[PDB]
Design a protein around this ligand. Structure first.
Ligand SMILES: CCCCCCCCCCCCCCCCCC(=O)OC[C@H](COP(=O)([O-])OCC(O)COP(=O)([O-])OC[C@@H](COC(=O)CCCCCCCCCCCCCCCCC)OC(=O)CCCCCCCCCCCCCCCCC)OC(=O)CCCCCCCCCCCCCCCCC
Lengths: 50, 74
């Protein structure tokens, strides 16, 4: 239920939260060809599940 | 006498004007109620306006709340 944007201005500053999110690989899609891919995380993403 | 009867008949010739004078009297007693209802209206829509406008209607008195969060980034 937690998202990276929840930490901004309440626990950590914005520029530091971006660095933490980008250290993870998040799945997104589908692309124009109907396939899945990975990308670094952003403030809108949820805490990654193991 | 016919002269007397004529003056009594004419006593109520200006009905329409007297009703207009009634309008003035009543509306003068009612119109002040616009101030209480006006204060409450502005009081309700104040927080939906931009920050820049909120500081103008109060002559710089109003300011953002200081609750200890969302401070500048180093
Ligand atoms: C002897 C006995 C003595 C006893 C002891 C003493 C007694 C007294 C002690 C009192 C102590 C205080 C007590 C606590 C009170 C305050 C706390 C409180 O209550 O807070 C509420 C409390 C929390 O408050 P809050 O929301 O946190 O407060 C945030 C602030 O409001 C924050 O608000 P904001 O930031 O969003 O906005 C603020 C803003 C707001 O600003 C505005 O909105 C407008 C600002 C622009 C105004 C522009 C005016 C332009 C014209 C100026 C004219 C100048 C003329 C000059 C003439 C000069 C002549 C020489 O104001 C300002 O910025 C400051 C104003 C500065 C400008 C100066 C001008 C002010 C206006 C003047 C108007 C004119 C006055 C005169 C009129 C007459 C003459 C003409 O809420 C609750 O507790 C809620 C509980 C739940 C309630 C449930 C209710 C029922 C629910 C069920 C409903 C259904 C059933 C129906 C039930 C019906 C039941 C009736």
């Amino acid at each position: 239920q937690l998202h990276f944007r929840h930490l901004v201005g309440e626990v950590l500053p914005e520029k530091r939260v971006k660095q933490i999110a980008a250290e993870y690989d998040v799945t997104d899609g589908p692309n124009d060809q109907g396939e899945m891919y990975t990308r670094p995380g952003i403030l809108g993403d949820a805490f990654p599940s193991p | 006498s016919r002269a007397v009867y004529a003056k009594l008949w004419a006593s109520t010739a200006q009905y329409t004007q007297r009703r207009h004078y009634a309008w003035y009297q009543i509306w003068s007693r009612v119109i002040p109620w616009s101030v209480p209802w006006g204060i409450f209206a502005m009081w309700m829509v104040f927080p939906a306006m931009p920050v820049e406008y909120r500081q103008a209607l109060t002559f710089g008195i109003w300011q953002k709340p200081n609750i200890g969060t969302h401070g500048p980034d180093p």
